[PDB]
């Protein structure tokens, strides 16, 4: 288990060094996105709290395909402004409940030191 806190102010300097195996030792959810959505990373907590498959989520678009209750202006259009802006970093809870027993989570978006790329994390509340 890799020892970094959900909420961490300088997280993304700590998960920058982390390889997918690595992240999949984090004590939380965590999805890295692209400037568009599209999943580049995904451990297995956010497999575990979801129901989802993190191998066969990557490349599919996070907005779009694979969970359609964040596109709302209350999640993927904070998102959008984020990566229009350039920088990103909001936390709120939130209901997950597409094809699943609605999960209330916190969700932390925060944008990644590595140049277009953002993370997405998540933990139960």
């Not at 300097?13 to 030792?25: E, P, R, S, V």
């Not at 890295?32 to 497999?47: C, P, S, T």
């Not at 229009?84 to 932390?108: C, I, R, W």
Request: aromatic share 12%; charged share 25%.
């Amino acid at each position: 288990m890799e020892h970094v806190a959900f909420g961490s102010e300088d997280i993304e300097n700590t998960l920058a060094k982390m390889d997918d195996g690595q992240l999949d030792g984090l004590a939380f959810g965590a999805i890295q996105l692209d400037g568009d959505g599209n999943i580049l990373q995904y451990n297995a907590a956010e497999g575990d709290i979801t129901g989802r498959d993190p191998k066969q989520v990557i490349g599919k678009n996070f907005f779009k395909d694979v969970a359609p209750c964040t596109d709302s202006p209350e999640f993927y259009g904070k998102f959008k402004e984020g990566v229009a802006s350039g920088n990103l970093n909001t936390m709120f809870e939130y209901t997950f409940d597409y094809q699943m027993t609605p999960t209330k989570v916190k969700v932390h978006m925060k944008k990644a030191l590595s140049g277009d790329s953002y993370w997405v994390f998540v933990k139960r509340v």
